[PDB]
Nucleic acid binder design. Structure first.
Lengths: 53, 49, 53
DNA sequence: CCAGAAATTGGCACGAAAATTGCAATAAATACAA
DNA sequence: TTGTATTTATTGCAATTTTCGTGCCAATTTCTGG
């Protein structure tokens, strides 16, 4: 929705692509994750919950 | 360099063909002792694993 | 014995002037060109088969 | 100390949601001929 | 004046599969009163 394309194009583009950041090297698909509900109406990413655990 | 008390004479073949005979007092006074400094490096990189 | 394996990033993310900036990796971006010497003989003077090819 | 009771764990299940893959050729702007 | 052949401009829809969270319960481990 942000880039005004189809999610098939977004899925194909981010396949086996890597990104270099001061924190390290991450695959482009590492930034998509599920979520678990948070009290107050918000949501919490499963990556954050795994790090907290 | 350093100022050395020197004599010009042969001494039992120990100054043969530009050899030099040195007193032990020179060594005991650290008159030709030098300091040498060396550098080592360790690099931590980023891998795929 | 052995040495670690690495991966060449495709996207670089940095922080310039307090803003997070994104760019492509110029050392791995694919690119092509057109052979001008071969393309300079596309004229009707030569044979028509050569022209269509 | 012991045996009953309570707590822990993970395999299987189930509905839903998200991601992946098959499809293969058209539509419109432009320049030229009567 | 127009009708037509040529050259750029097109990077989505719709099945199908896979993954998500969470419940049921048996097997396993740990705790506690007589």
């Amino acid at each position: 929705q942000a880039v005004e394309m189809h999610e098939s194009t977004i899925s194909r583009v981010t396949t086996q692509k890597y990104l270099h950041s001061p924190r390290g090297i991450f695959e482009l698909k590492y930034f998509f994750s599920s979520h678990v509900n948070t009290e107050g109406g918000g949501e919490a990413s499963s990556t954050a919950i795994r790090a907290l655990v | 360099g350093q100022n050395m008390r020197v004599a010009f004479m042969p001494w039992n073949g120990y100054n043969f063909e530009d050899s030099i005979l040195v007193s032990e007092r020179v060594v005991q006074e650290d008159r030709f002792t030098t300091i040498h400094i060396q550098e080592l490096a360790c690099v931590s990189r980023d891998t795929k694993l | 014995t052995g040495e670690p394996e690495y991966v060449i990033p495709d996207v670089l993310v940095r922080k310039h002037n307090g803003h997070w900036t994104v760019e492509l990796n110029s050392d791995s971006i694919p690119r092509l060109q057109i052979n001008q010497h071969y393309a300079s003989m596309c004229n009707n003077a030569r044979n028509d088969g050569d022209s269509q090819f």
